[PDB]
Every structure is written in C-alpha cells, then in structure tokens.
Amino acid sequence: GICKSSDCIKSAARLIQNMDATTEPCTDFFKYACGGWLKRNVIPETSSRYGNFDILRDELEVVLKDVLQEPKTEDIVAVQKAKALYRSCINESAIDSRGGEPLLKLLPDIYGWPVATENWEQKYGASWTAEKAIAQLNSKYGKKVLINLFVGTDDKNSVNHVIHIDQPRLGLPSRDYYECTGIYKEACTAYVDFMISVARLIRQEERLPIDENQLALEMNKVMELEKEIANATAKPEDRNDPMLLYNKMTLAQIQNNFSLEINGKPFSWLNFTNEIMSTVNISITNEEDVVVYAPEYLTKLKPILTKYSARDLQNLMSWRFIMDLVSSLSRTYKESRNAFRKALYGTTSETATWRRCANYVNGNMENAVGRLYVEAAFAGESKHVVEDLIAQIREVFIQTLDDLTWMDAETKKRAEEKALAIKERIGYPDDIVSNDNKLNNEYLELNYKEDEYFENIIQNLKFSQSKQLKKLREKVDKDEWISGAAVVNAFYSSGRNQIVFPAGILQPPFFSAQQSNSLNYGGIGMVIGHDITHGFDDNGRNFNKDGDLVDWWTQQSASNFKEQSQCMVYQYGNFSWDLAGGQHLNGINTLGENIADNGGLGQAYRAYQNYIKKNGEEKLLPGLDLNHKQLFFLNFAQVWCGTYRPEYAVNSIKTDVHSPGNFRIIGTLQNSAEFSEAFHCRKNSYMNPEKKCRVW
Numbered sequence: 126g127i128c129k130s131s132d133c134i135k136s137a138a139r140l141i142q143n144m145d146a147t148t149e150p151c152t153d154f155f156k157y158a159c160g161g162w163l164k165r166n167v168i169p170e171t172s173s174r175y176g177n178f179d180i181l182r183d184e185l186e187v188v189l190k191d192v193l194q195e196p197k198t199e200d201i202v203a204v205q206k207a208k209a210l211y212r213s214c215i216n217e218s219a220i221d222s223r224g225g226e227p228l229l230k231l232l233p234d235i236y237g238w239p240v241a242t243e244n245w246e247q248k249y250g251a252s253w254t255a256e257k258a259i260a261q262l263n264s265k266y267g268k269k270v271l272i273n274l275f276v277g278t279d280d281k282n283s284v285n286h287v288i289h290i291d292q293p294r295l296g297l298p299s300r301d302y303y304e305c306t307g308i309y310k311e312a313c314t315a316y317v318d319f320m321i322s323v324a325r326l327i328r329q330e331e332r333l334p335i336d337e338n339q340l341a342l343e344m345n346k347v348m349e350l351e352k353e354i355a356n357a358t359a360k361p362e363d364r365n366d367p368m369l370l371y372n373k374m375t376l377a378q379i380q381n382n383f384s385l386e387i388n389g390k391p392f393s394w395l396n397f398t399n400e401i402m403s404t405v406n407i408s409i410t411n412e413e414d415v416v417v418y419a420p421e422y423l424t425k426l427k428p429i430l431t432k433y434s435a436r437d438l439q440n441l442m443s444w445r446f447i448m449d450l451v452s453s454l455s456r457t458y459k460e461s462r463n464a465f466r467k468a469l470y471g472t473t474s475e476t477a478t479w480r481r482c483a484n485y486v487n488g489n490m491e492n493a494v495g496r497l498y499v500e501a502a503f504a505g506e507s508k509h510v511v512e513d514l515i516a517q518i519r520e521v522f523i524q525t526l527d528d529l530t531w532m533d534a535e536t537k538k539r540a541e542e543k544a545l546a547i548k549e550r551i552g553y554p555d556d557i558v559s560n561d562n563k564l565n566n567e568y569l570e571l572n573y574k575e576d577e578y579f580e581n582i583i584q585n586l587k588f589s590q591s592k593q594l595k596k597l598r599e600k601v602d603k604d605e606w607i608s609g610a611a612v613v614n615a616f617y618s619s620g621r622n623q624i625v626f627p628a629g630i631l632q633p634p635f636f637s638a639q640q641s642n643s644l645n646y647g648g649i650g651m652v653i654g655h656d657i658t659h660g661f662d663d664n665g666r667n668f669n670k671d672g673d674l675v676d677w678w679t680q681q682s683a684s685n686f687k688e689q690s691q692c693m694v695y696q697y698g699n700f701s702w703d704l705a706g707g708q709h710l711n712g713i714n715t716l717g718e719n720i721a722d723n724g725g726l727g728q729a730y731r732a733y734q735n736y737i738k739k740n741g742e743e744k745l746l747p748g749l750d751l752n753h754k755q756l757f758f759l760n761f762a763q764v765w766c767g768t769y770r771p772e773y774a775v776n777s778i779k780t781d782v783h784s785p786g787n788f789r790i791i792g793t794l795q796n797s798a799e800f801s802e803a804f805h806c807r808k809n810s811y812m813n814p815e816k817k818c819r820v821w
C-alpha cells in the first residue's frame with residue numbers, strides 16, 4: 126500500500142532532497158527538515174535572504190516575463206498598456222540615452238535640490254513654505270516627508286475614510302541605523318556617499334562647478350537633520366497597541382496642540398491639508414476630524430525644526446524622493462544605488478532588469494498582470510479545494526474555542542461571530558478574467574509612451590495618490606482584494622476582517638490536488654490557520670467582526686490573553702540567532718506572527734486528523750520511512766526552509782515582525798505535543814520542552 130504514481134515519487138524526491146536523516150528530529154527539526162536544502166541552495170548575489178518563498182517568487186517572475194514580453198493579437202487595452210509599460214521598462218538603450226535629463230526637468234516642480242542648484246535661495250528660497258513643499262511631494266508624487274498625511278480607513282468606523290497624521294518613513298531601513306556607530310557605521314557612511322554621488326552626477330550633467338568639500342558639508346547636514354527626525358519617531362513596541370495609537374481630534378485642536386515654526390513661519394495645518402486635498406477638488410475646514418498616530422513625534426518635531434533653514438529641509442525632502450527615482454534612470458545613476466544596497470543588504474549584484482520590470486508592472490497593474498498570470502499558471506480546480514480547506518479550518522477554530530478555558534462564555538460567543546464574519550478570497554477575483562470592460566476602465570487615465578519609462582513611472586505615482594486622496598468622502602469598497610493574484614504570500618486585514626490566498630501561494634510545496642493531503646494540511650492548511658489566527662492576535666483581537674476598533678473582551682479574558690501570550694514573548698525572546706552574531710529575537714515585535722504560527726499549525730493538524738477520521742489513512746510515499754502524521758510536520762518545516770545574509774540579519778533582528786524560518790519551525794513545534802507524539806520525542810529533548818506556551 127505504497128503510492129506508485131509519478132507525482133508521489135516527485136513529492137518523495139523533493140522531501141528527501143531537502144531533509145537530513147543524519148540529524149535527530151527531536152534535537153533540531155529545522156536541521157532535520159532543511160539540512161539538505163541548506164547544503165544544496167546558496168543565497169543568490171541579488172538576494173539578501175533565500176528560502177522556499179524566494180524560489181517560488183523567482184519562478185513567478187519568469188511566468189510574468191513570459192506573459193508580458195510577447196504581444197498577442199487578441200490583447201484587451203488593459204493588457205496592451207501592461208505590455209507597453211514592461212517594454213518601456215526593459216529598453217535600457219532608450220533609458221541610458223536620456224541620462225539624468227528626466228530628473229533635471231522634474232526638480233523645479235518640487236522646489237529644486239539645493240546642493241545640485243546654483244543660487245537656490247534666489248530661485249526658490251523667497252516663495253518657499255513647509256506647507257507647499259511637503260504637500261507637493263505628497264499630492265503629486267505620493268512621497269511623504271517630515272509629516273506623513275494620508276487618507277485611510279477610520280479604525281473605529283471601518284466603512285468610512287479619514288485623514289491620518291503619522292510619523293514619516295526614514296531613508297535608512299529603521300530609526301536604529303541613525304546611531305551610526307558599530308554595525309550601523311558602514312550603512313550611514315554609504316548613505317551619505319550615495320547622497321554625494323547623485324549630487325555630483327546632477328551637477329556634472331548641468332556643467333556646474335563640483336566643490337567636493339561643499340557636497341560633503343551639505344549632505345552630512347542632511348544626515349544630521351534626519352538623525353534628529355529618526356530619534357523623534359516612536360519605537361515599534363510603543364505603536365503595537367491600536368487603541369493607544371488612535372487619537373481622533375479636529376484640525377483646530379491640532380493647530381493648538383502641535384504648533385510648529387518651520388523656516389521661522391508658523392505652520393498652518395489647514396493650509397497644508399488643503400494644498401493636498403485641493404488636487405482632488407475637496408475643501409477642508411477647521412472642523413475636519415483627523416486621526417493623529419504620532420502625537421509625541423509632532424511635539425518633538427517643534428524644537429528640532431527651529432534649528433534648520435528651508436535650504437536644509439529641501440535638501441532632505443528632495444533627496445528622499447530622488448532615492449526612489451535612481452532605479453528608473455541611466456546605468457550611471459544605478460551604480461551609486463548598487464553601492465548603498467551592498468553596504469545595507471550585502472547584495473553584490475543588481476536584480477536582472479526584466480525581473481525588476483515584471484515586479485514593477487505587477488505592483489502598478491495587479492489586476493491586468495493577475496489576469497495574464499492565472500490564465501498562464503493557475504489550475505481552476507485549486508479554487509474549489511482550497512475554499513473547502515478554509516471551510517474546515519474556520520470550523521476547527523470555532524470548535525477549538527470550547528477547549529479554551531481561560532476565555533469566559535460571552536467572549537467565546539463574540540470570537541465565534543468574528544470567525545464567522547471573516548471574508549475569504551481565493552486565487553483571484555473572477556471579474557479580472559470575465560469582465561474586460563471593468564478592467565480597461567481601471568487603467569483608463571493611464572497612457573504610456575514606450576520610449577519614456579521615467580514619464581510612465583511619474584504618471585503612475587500621480588494616478589495612485591489621486592485614487593487614494595479622492596476616497597476621503599467615499600465609503601470603503603467591500604468587493605476589493607487586499608492582494609493581486611500574482612503574489613507568493615497570504616494576508617489578513619483587521620480593517621476588512623478578510624483573509625486572501627492569491628494564486629501565487631496555491632502551488633507546491635503549499636498545495637497541489639496531486640500531492641498528498643498530509644502535505645496540503647502541513648503547507649497551505651497551516652497558512653490558512655495562520656491568517657485566520659491574525660484576526661485574534663495581540664493586534665487583530667482589538668477589532669470586531671466588521672473591522673471596527675472596539676473592545677469585545679471582558680477585562681478577565683483580556684488579562685488571560687496577555688498572560689498566555691506573555692509565555693511566547695519570553696520563549697522567542699530567549700532564542701539566540703547565530704546569523705545575527707548570537708543576538709536574541711525581539712519577542713514583542715514578533716509576537717503577532719508567533720501567535721499566528723502556533724495557532725495556525727494546531728488548527729491545520731486537527732483539520733487533518735478530522736479528515737483522516739472520515740476518509741481514512743492515505744497511501745505512504747515511496748523511499749521515505751515516515752507516516753503521514755510525520756509528513757504533515759515535515760512539509761510545514763520545509764515550507765519555511767531558508768537562510769539570511771549575516772549583513773542583513775545582525776540588523777533585521779531588531780525590527781523584523783516575523784521570526785526567522787528556523788525559529789518559526791523550532792518555536793511552534795516546541796509548543797506542539799502533537800509533534801512530539803508523531804516523532805516520539807524524549808521528555809526534555811530540545812524540541813519537546815516541559816513548558817509549552819499556547820493561545821489558540
């Protein structure tokens with residue numbers, strides 16, 4: 126009774142290639158499950174990390190290349206535009222011939238880049254106001270600097286949009302980098318050298334004198350300014366409670382409580398907001414309600430901005446925008462970027478042009494590219510079977526509530542209601558394939574010229590920002606997907622109470638109608654459980670069945686949750702990551718993903734046990750002396766096999782919201798008695814500790 130099919134042999138081969146039977150399962154299951162993987166697969170020169178997910182993403186890019194690179198006679202206007210955008214992106218002849226000219230033509234429209242301008246004060250200094258300069262980058266280009274103003278869903282009224290004020294993103298990956306001492310020194314030095322190189326190239330291209338000493342002074346001052354801004358931002362552990370982050374008030378209250386003097390001019394919040402919303406023909410009064418996510422940042426900004434001139438501020442602001450544009454310019458400009466990416470990520474090589482270009486088109490025309498991808502790569506039978514697996518795991522979560530004693534009967538009822546109201550999205554929205562008209566209308570305003578890639582990306586920035594700002598007075602679309610189809614990932618939205626499984630993740634090793642159901646439950650089954658469990662993690666539990674930020678917990682059940690979850694903060698906090706020079710994981714930053722992993726694997730195992738109880742044991746795999754209980758856990762581990770560069774691991778441990786793959790496997794399996802039963806693990810072996818954490 127061993128499976129004899131081609132598919133079982135190829136499944137068995139894959140499992141055997143990746144594992145290492147010269148390790149004990151109960152000593153380190155990562156090594157046992159992924160030892161073979163780690164010996165075989167090296168981290169590509171273009172990758173900062175590598176694993177099952179990255180390999181599937183590289184393979185997805187090849188499908189996108191193959192469906193984008195050839196015209197077809199029967200292509201609708203949406204597909205033609207996507208293919209025209211791709212062709213403009215890969216034509217490096219046309220891009221190299223234009224040098225930096227497209228950036229030079231644009232710079233006046235953002236009030237210039239002083240370091241790269243002769244007589245900046247005379248040209249722009251007079252007419253310059255923080256309000257107009259920040260609004261312009263925001264409204265026209267989608268770039269948020271100093272003050273992050275955006276139109277988003279109201280946390281407390283999930284059917285409406287509201288204007289948010291938040292701290293902005295930094296030029297370096299996180300605030301920690303702006304210490305610029307020790308492991309960060311390389312990054313900060315490369316960041317300034319990147320600024321100077323682009324400044325030198327713009328000056329050389331406009332035939333201005335290059336004073337090397339002057340470039341250094343100015344760009345070292347941009348870094349000094351951004352050091353203060355970063356130091357003013359709230360830490361991720363102070364932004365992880367959505368109730369304390371929500372602070373609704375009026376533009377009037379804002380004008381009083383968060384006063385700023387910028388360039389010696391009192392900042393007008395009303396002038397700032399109207400500068401942005403006036404681009405979509407919407408007026409704003411002092412009565413306008415606004416969510417402030419970063420009160421303490423705005424307060425710390427006041428003393429900082431007193432010490433800096435318009436010239437100092439625009440040198441930072443314009444640079445933050447130029448950073449995002451370099452990859453759309455000539456070979457020469459991309460050289461300066463590659464050096465900084467090496468210093469930061471440890472990558473020695475630039476990603477293949479056609480890979481970067483496929484990903485750009487997918488990111489900007491997700492429905493058009495999704496349509497092409499699913500026709501090319503996606504079965505159709507997959508949608509039905511996965512919809513069934515989601516049904517089973519959703520019911521397993523609901524049934525599991527009865528076993529959860531630390532929750533009272535009323536909190537159990539509220540949880541079941543949320544679980545029943547979770548909106549599932551599988552593969553792709555049918556309308557991208559079946560409704561040509563709706564898809565065309567989505568991209569109607571977009572008109573791409575094939576010899577103008579830079580004009581094409583600038584048009585894309587205006588299009589996206591326009592669409593987002595003009596939602597302020599509209600209601601949230603309930604039919605909208607939080608992911609395109611050509612994506613190797615899965616998501617939960619607390620605001621929509623929605624789980625998405627794009628076509629990209631519904632392939633081996635996660636899922637196949639052909640592969641064993643033990644592998645399906647251990648792969649996509651655990652991924653389904655994970656994303657359902659996100660609705661009930663330290664963040665998601667604060668939102669109710671309609672995505673409204675409202676406490677549906679008793680004080681006792683809430684205390685109990687914190688108690689249970691605290692176990693997992695300490696468990697993962699005690700993990701020492703050797704690729705990060707033995708630094709400990711941040712148990713608080715990773716808690717959400719850690720709750721989801723532990724919860725998700727348990728839900729998936731129970732669903733598989735129920736599947737067995739009904740449909741009975743299935744045929745073993747040839748060449749593997751393993752039962753199907755063991756294959757479930759083995760596929761789980763192999764789904765998360767991967768490795769990281771020591772360069773982008775000693776840094777990323779402090780900010781990462783996911784645990785590394787090895788601790789995702791070790792952490793969850795340590796907390797599973799079912800794992801230790803399937804591999805008969807001796808009590809107090811590394812993988813079978815006596816203390817086991819659990820929430821869901």
Ligand SMILES: *[C@@H]1O[C@H](CO)[C@@H](O)[C@H](O)[C@H]1NC(C)=O
Nearest residue numbers: 212216217218219222575576
């Ligand atoms: C690329 O651009 C060049 C220069 O503008 C143009 O002559 C050529 O037709 C384009 N080639 C392709 C393959 O699109």
Ligand SMILES: *[C@@H]1O[C@H](CO)[C@@H](O)[C@H](O)[C@H]1NC(C)=O
Nearest residue numbers: 352353355356357358421425
């Ligand atoms: C950082 O901000 C705090 C107050 O928010 C201040 O005490 C400190 O001087 C700031 N600057 C640096 C370099 O830490």
Ligand SMILES: *[C@@H]1O[C@H](CO)[C@@H](O)[C@H](O)[C@H]1NC(C)=O
Nearest residue numbers: 254256395396397399400403
């Ligand atoms: C904001 O103030 C500037 C002058 O500083 C003015 O030219 C502009 O029209 C104002 N914009 C709005 C939207 O009030």
Ligand SMILES: *[C@@H]1O[C@H](CO)[C@@H](O)[C@H](O)[C@H]1NC(C)=O
Nearest residue numbers: 694695696697698699709712
């Ligand atoms: C490690 O676990 C111990 C015992 O549970 C706990 O006291 C400690 O806080 C944990 N360490 C970290 C860094 O989280």
Ligand SMILES: [Zn+2]
Nearest residue numbers: 655659718721
């Ligand atoms: Zn997750």
